[PDB]
């Protein structure tokens, strides 16, 4: 393993300005804001998480471990952590992704989402995951809820709360126990708590299924405890109505019990790119041709153009 020379930037609180609330969770509130590094004549749209005063030492540690992972990744299809701020509670500053999570996006915009967007998103997520594989990172929580939308044309993988860096000689991560996203997990993760890049491929297949059904819940109504035996009997998620057999076969291959029989991310990039070149041959969507989606503010620059 090579040295990790990623830079962690510690921002001062007077450099960023909270504009409005975007969300509230167990761990603190998220604000829309601007990051205005002193004397640089640039304003960067950001989301700012300010942790709650009541957050435990254990929670703080876990959040900082997630920041470490996010600071260590740099790819157009993976979320961008700008830095953290050590005020009385920790604040985290990330690139603003104004269209929210992809799961919610596809549910809310399903009558205007055409085949080109769906296939491009699959390509993009596969590129991000391929990059994480190159970095020897196993995500362990890939799902449409954990993909952010910068613009309808550009998505990025997020939520590194479960991510693990494999050791140099290590091929599998062995987990301890807790509350796990069963319906996205590879069979070997459910049974034996084993995670690899190939178990992430399984989750990728489920993520694709979520997109192609415009945000349906996988195995809806089936309790999580029944999933493993359903899988062991050879049953899988059904073929979405818009999917040609070409697309469904790819998902099916992601859900092979033999981990080595599943596609690799680099191959998923290739197969979805082929399809993205002639999208209406691969996804059959009523009204496809018709569909369109969105495409002081002086000195504003996106985080992706503010390089270190
Ligand atoms: C869908 C995502 C969504 O819309 N969430 C609301 C907040 N929001 C709106 C736009 C936007 N852009 C960018 N980021 C966020 N939120 C956000 C999440 C996490 C975060 O920083 C961290 C980093 C590491 C760990 C944590 C945590 F403490 F563990 F939570 C937080 C920041 Cl700064 C911002 C945005 C959600 N859908 C319900 C699934």
């Amino acid at each position: 393993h090579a040295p990790n020379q990623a830079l962690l930037r510690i921002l001062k609180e007077t450099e960023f300005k909270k504009i409005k609330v975007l969300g509230s969770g167990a761990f603190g509130t998220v604000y829309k804001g601007l990051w205005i590094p002193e004397g640089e004549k640039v304003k960067i749209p950001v989301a700012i998480k300010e942790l709650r005063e009541a957050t435990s030492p254990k929670a703080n540690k876990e959040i900082l471990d997630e920041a470490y992972v996010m600071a260590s990744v740099d790819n157009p299809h993976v979320c961008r952590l700008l830095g953290i701020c050590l005020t009385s509670t920790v604040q985290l500053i990330m690139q603003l992704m104004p269209f929210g999570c992809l799961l919610d996006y596809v549910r809310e915009h399903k009558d205007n989402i055409g085949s080109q967007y769906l296939l491009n998103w699959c390509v993009q997520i596969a590129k991000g995951m391929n990059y994480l594989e190159d970095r020897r990172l196993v995500h362990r929580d890939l799902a449409a809820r954990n993909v952010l939308v910068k613009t309808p044309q550009h998505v990025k993988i997020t939520d590194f709360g479960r991510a693990k860096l494999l050791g140099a000689e290590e091929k599998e991560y062995h987990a301890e126990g807790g509350k796990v996203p069963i319906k996205w997990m590879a069979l070997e993760s459910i049974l034996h708590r084993i995670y690899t890049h190939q178990s992430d491929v399984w989750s990728y297949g489920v993520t694709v299924w979520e997109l192609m059904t415009f945000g349906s819940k996988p195995y809806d109504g089936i309790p999580a405890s029944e999933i493993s035996s359903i899988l062991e009997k050879g049953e899988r998620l059904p073929q979405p109505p818009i999917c040609t057999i070409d697309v469904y076969m790819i998902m099916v291959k992601c859900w092979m019990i033999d981990a080595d029989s599943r596609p690799k991310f680099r191959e998923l990039i290739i197969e979805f790119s082929k399809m993205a070149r002639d999208p209406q041959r691969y996804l059959v969507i009523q009204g496809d041709e018709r569909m369109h989606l969105p495409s002081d503010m002086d000195d504003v620059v996106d985080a992706d153009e503010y390089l270190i």
Side-chain angles (χ1 to χ4, degrees):
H1 242 110
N4 181 355
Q5 309 181 80
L7 296 181
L8 174 70
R9 216 178 146 157
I10 310 300
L11 309 182
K12 65 168 174 159
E13 160 158 69
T14 63
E15 276 187 333
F16 52 86
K17 139 184 154 89
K18 296 161 194 187
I19 297 164
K20 74 162 196 180
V21 173
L22 293 176
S24 294
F27 302 105
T29 126
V30 180
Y31 302 86
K32 178 193 287 179
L34 285 174
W35 177 36
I36 309 161
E38 188 157 19
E40 271 194 70
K41 202 177 137 63
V42 75
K43 293 168 189 178
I44 295 125
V46 295
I48 301 151
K49 178 139 202 146
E50 181 162 39
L51 303 185
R52 283 173 63 185
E53 199 69 61
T55 51
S56 64
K58 185 177 193 274
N60 277 320
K61 174 181 290 194
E62 285 180 9
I63 284 158
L64 291 167
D65 291 352
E66 174 166 11
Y68 160 89
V69 178
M70 280 181 183
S72 298
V73 292
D74 170 39
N75 179 270
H77 303 293
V78 176
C79 63
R80 173 83 107 100
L81 180 72
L82 304 161
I84 63 176
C85 179
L86 263 58
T87 40
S88 67
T89 77
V90 174
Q91 301 184 72
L92 299 102
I93 301 88
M94 299 192 67
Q95 166 182 39
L96 182 66
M97 305 291 269
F99 299 84
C101 298
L102 185 53
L103 177 57
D104 304 280
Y105 187 86
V106 298
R107 296 172 167 172
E108 293 167 11
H109 295 93
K110 72 203 192 223
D111 299 310
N112 278 115
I113 291 170
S115 57
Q116 188 72 73
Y117 279 88
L118 285 162
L119 296 167
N120 286 356
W121 296 333
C122 296
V123 174
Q124 294 179 22
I125 292 162
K127 291 185 169 179
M129 287 312 295
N130 181 68
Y131 165 84
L132 295 179
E133 179 168 9
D134 282 351
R135 295 295 323 299
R136 307 186 40 81
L137 222 138
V138 178
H139 187 287
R140 307 200 317 128
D141 203 9
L142 183 60
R145 58 175 179 275
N146 286 338
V147 176
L148 291 179
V149 184
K150 181 191 172 179
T151 68
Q153 300 79 33
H154 189 165
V155 303
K156 300 186 183 191
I157 294 149
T158 195
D159 193 333
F160 289 82
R162 278 166 50 80
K164 297 304 156 92
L165 166 63
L166 296 184
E169 298 275 58
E170 200 189 12
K171 203 219 160 183
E172 317 181 330
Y173 177 74
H174 307 267
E176 299 190 77
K179 285 174 182 186
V180 295
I182 295 285
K183 293 169 175 187
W184 281 260
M185 284 160 64
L187 181 64
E188 71 271 14
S189 308
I190 303 162
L191 265 27
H192 311 304
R193 298 185 190 155
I194 286 164
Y195 297 82
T196 62
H197 301 300
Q198 292 310 102
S199 68
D200 280 342
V201 170
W202 183 298
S203 310
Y204 174 88
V206 176
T207 307
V208 170
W209 184 93
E210 297 181 87
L211 305 185
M212 301 302 164
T213 55
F214 307 96
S216 302
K217 301 172 198 184
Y219 321 97
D220 199 12
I222 294 153
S225 70
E226 293 185 23
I227 295 301
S228 72
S229 59
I230 281 167
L231 295 174
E232 285 183 299
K233 292 169 204 192
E235 173 171 354
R236 298 300 187 266
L237 292 166
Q239 184 167 354
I242 69 167
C243 290
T244 56
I245 184 172
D246 300 75
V247 179
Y248 187 52
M249 183 70 59
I250 293 177
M251 284 170 234
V252 170
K253 284 169 181 179
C254 293
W255 308 321
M256 295 287 148
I257 292 183
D258 178 48
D260 295 328
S261 298
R262 298 173 203 153
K264 287 148 177 124
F265 286 116
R266 67 171 299 286
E267 293 163 345
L268 296 164
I269 299 171
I270 285 160
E271 292 302 305
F272 281 105
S273 297
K274 288 174 179 163
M275 293 185 297
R277 286 168 54 97
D278 187 9
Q280 301 188 11
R281 186 180 168 181
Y282 298 103
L283 293 180
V284 183
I285 296 175
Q286 197 216 233
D288 206 358
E289 326 79 41
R290 297 176 201 245
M291 287 170 192
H292 263 291
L293 293 165
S295 176
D296 191 27
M297 275 155 192
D298 280 4
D299 297 325
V300 168
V301 141
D302 194 86
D304 287 337
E305 280 72 53
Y306 188 78
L307 278 99
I308 202 80

